[PDB]
Amino acid sequence: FVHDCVNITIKQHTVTTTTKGKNFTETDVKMMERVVEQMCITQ
Amino acid sequence: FVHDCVNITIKQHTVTTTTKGKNFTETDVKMMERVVEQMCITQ
Amino acid sequence: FVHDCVNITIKQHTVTTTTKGKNFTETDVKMMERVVEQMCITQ
Amino acid sequence: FVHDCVNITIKQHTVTTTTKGKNFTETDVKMMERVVEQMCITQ
Amino acid sequence: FVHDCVNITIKQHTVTTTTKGKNFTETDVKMMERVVEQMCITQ
Amino acid sequence: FVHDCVNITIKQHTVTTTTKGKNFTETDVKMMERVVEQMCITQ
């Protein structure tokens, strides 16, 4: 009944901004309303 | 009944902006309303 | 009934900004309304 | 050399919003970079 | 050399908002970088 | 060399907000960098 579960995620980044009136600059983003996340289930 | 589950995701990036009145610049983004994510299930 | 659960995430970043009236600059962000997260379940 | 200068501007409005994740709703707006406005000149 | 200068501006408004995550709602707004405004000049 | 200078501006408003995470709601606003405003000049 053996399972296994692995996940790697390296996220390198470098932002820069010089605004003159308006700027938002939202980097990597998510949103999940009724999220139900799981992993390695053996019901 | 053996399973296995692997997933890697490296995400290198470098943004830059010099606005003069309006700018948004949203990098890698997602959204999932009623998300139900799983992995390595053996019901 | 053996399981296993691993996940690594290194997140290097370096932001900089010199505004002249408005700027937001929100780096990596998420939001999950009715989140129910789990890991390595063997019900 | 008589002049005259009149200008009226009534601006009635009524906004409303019920957001669920993003909304801007900028009402009557302007912007003028090197503006040089005058009135009733008799050089 | 007579001049005259008049200007009226009544601005009635009524905003309302019920946000659920993000909202800006900027009402009547302006911006003028190197503005030089005058009135009733007789150089 | 007679001049005259008049300007009236009544500004009635009524805002209201019930936020659930973020909200800005900036009412009538301006900004003028190198502003040089005058009135009724007879150089």
DSSP label of A33: T
Joined together, the tokens standing for residue E21 give 């995550």
| Cβ D19 vs Cβ E20: under 8 Å | yes
CA distance E42 to E31: 27
- Nearest CA to F34 among E41, A20, E32, A21? E32
Interfacial A residues in 1-43 facing B (CB < 8 Å): 1-43
Contact between chain E and chain D (3 or more Cβ pairs less than 8 Å apart): yes
Contact between chain E and chain F (3 or more Cβ pairs less than 8 Å apart): yes
**3-class secondary-structure state, position E31:** coil
DSSP string, F1-43: -----EEE----B---B--SS------SB---TT-----SB--
Strand-pair category, F6-8 with E6-8: parallel
- Nearest CA to C40 among B19, B15, E25, A5? A5
Q: How far lies E12's CA from each of D16, E8, F1, F8, F12, in Å?
A: 14, 13, 37, 14, 5
Neighbours of chain F (3+ CB pairs under 8 A): E
Q: Quote the distance between the C-alpha of residue B27 and its chain's center.
A: 10
- Nearest CA to C20 among D9, D34, B23? B23
- Nearest CA to D28 among F28, E8, C23, E33? F28
Contact assignment for E20 to D19 by CB distance below 8 Å = yes
DSSP string, chain C: -----EEE----B---B--SS------SB--BTT-----SB--
**3-class secondary-structure state, position C2:** coil
Q: Which residues contact C39 (CB under 8 A, 6 or more apart)?
A: A5, A38, A39, A40, C5
Best interface-test mutation with C: which of A1, A10, A17, A24 has the largest number of C CBs within 10 A? A17
| Cβ D14 vs Cβ E14: under 8 Å | yes
* Radius of gyration (C-alpha) of chain C in whole angstroms: 19
| Elucidation technique | cryo-EM
Q: Given in angstroms, what resolution was this structure solved at?
A: 3.1
Q: Kindly list the domain boundaries of chain E, sorted by start residue.
A: 1-43
Of F3, F22, F37, the CB nearest to E22: F22
Strand-pair category, B6-8 with A6-8: parallel
Joined together, the tokens standing for residue E42 give 């007789």
- Nearest CA to D22 among B33, C26, E20? E20
CB count in 10 Å sphere of residue B13: 14
Neighbours of chain E (3+ CB pairs under 8 A): D, F
| Cβ F29 vs Cβ D26: under 8 Å | no
Q: Quote the distance between the C-alpha of residue B8 and its chain's center.
A: 12
DSSP string, B4-24: --EEE----B---B--SS---
| Cβ E4 vs Cβ D4: under 8 Å | yes
Joined together, the tokens standing for residue B13 give 């990036």
**What pairs with residue D6 in β-bridges?**
E6
Contact assignment for A40 to C3 by CB distance below 8 Å = yes
| Residue A43: closest C-alpha in chain C | C43
